[PDB]
Structure 1
Amino acid sequence: SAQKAPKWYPSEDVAALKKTRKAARPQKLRASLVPGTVLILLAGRFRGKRVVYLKHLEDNTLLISGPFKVNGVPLRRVNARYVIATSTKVSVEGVNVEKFNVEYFAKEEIKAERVEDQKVVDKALIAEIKKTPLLKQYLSASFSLKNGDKPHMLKF
């Protein structure tokens, strides 16, 4: 023998896990994250887009639709930590967002049904947006930081 032996061998019975005392409680959002709040996206392909907050989904994501007719952002989830909530609000109670849940955004060209669901949702969003002035152009514009901007002093 090139190597003699082990005297005794370790057991290959894998030990069971101890009983975890970690429950999953619902996430407390920020005070500014109420539905209808205009959000500023901070990351993604839609960096700097001004979108509309519609629903808190059960996977701790915010369902947004910055109206696709306005700035071309569809209904999609975002993380609440990658979003600045502004003081600007619009009312919600004209959109039916209970259809959209965590498995609505499952993975496995554009899907046919996503287009009219976008059109149904934003139809009431733009009809609400057209009341207050300059909001449609505000949401069409993309936010950026200029020279002299201090986000610690800047209030959004």
Structure 2
Amino acid sequence: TAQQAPKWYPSEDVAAPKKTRKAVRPQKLRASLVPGTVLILLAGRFRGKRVVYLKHLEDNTLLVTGPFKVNGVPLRRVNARYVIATSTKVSVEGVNVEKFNVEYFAKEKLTKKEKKEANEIKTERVEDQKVVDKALLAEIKKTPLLKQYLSASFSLKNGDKPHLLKF
């Protein structure tokens, strides 16, 4: 023989893990995130845009909308860690946001064979957006310049220190 043998072979039966003791308490959001707060999206495709915060979802995500008529941000979910809670507050009583949850946003996962060589929207999603924004804009019309404020993007100018800036 080339190699002789091992005198004893390691057993192939994989052991079980110990009974772990990590329960899952619900997330405690920060104090500035109340429903109806204007947030600034710091990252993503819609970075630098100001959107209204609606609902704290199940998987620690924030349900937001532009509104879509204002700045083109649809009904979407974002991470609470990637936003800035501006103290500008709008009142969101008058929307039935209990329809949406984590299964409302499903990606319909793609197989490995479907490779995009070179290259649509739910009617339910666009009509839900149209339902919520028509109630939001009635509250937006109350205070002045809020529509233009939400349509404009946020950016840092020369001399803007975010550790001294208030939002």
Q: How many aligned positions are there?
A: 156
**2:68 is paired with a residue of what secondary structure?**
coil
CA deviation profile, 1:47-89 (whole Å, cap 9, x unmatched)? 0010000000000000000100000000010000100000001
Point out the more displaced range, 81-90 or 100-109: 100-109
Deviation of 1:118 (Å) = 0.2
Following the alignment from structure 1 to structure 2, what is the Cα–Cα distance between the partners of residues 32 and 74? 23
Of 123, 126, 130, which residue of structure 2 is paired with 1:115? 126
**2:69 is paired with a residue of what secondary structure?**
coil
Segments of 4+ moved more than 3 angstroms:
none
Following the alignment from structure 1 to structure 2, what is the Cα–Cα distance between the partners of residues 2 and 86? 73
CA RMSD between the two structures: 1.8
Deviation of 1:31 (Å) = 0.3
Distance 1:109 1:101, change over 3 A: closer
Following the alignment from structure 2 to structure 1, what is the Cα–Cα distance between the partners of residues 139 and 6? 77
Taking structure 1 as the reference length, what is the TM-score of the superposition? 0.98
Where does structure 1 lack aligned partners over 5 or more consecutive residues? none
Identity %: 93
Of 141, 146, 153, which residue of structure 2 is paired with 1:142? 153
Match of 2:5 in 1: 5
Match of 1:103 in 2: 103
Following the alignment from structure 1 to structure 2, what is the Cα–Cα distance between the partners of residues 33 and 87? 9
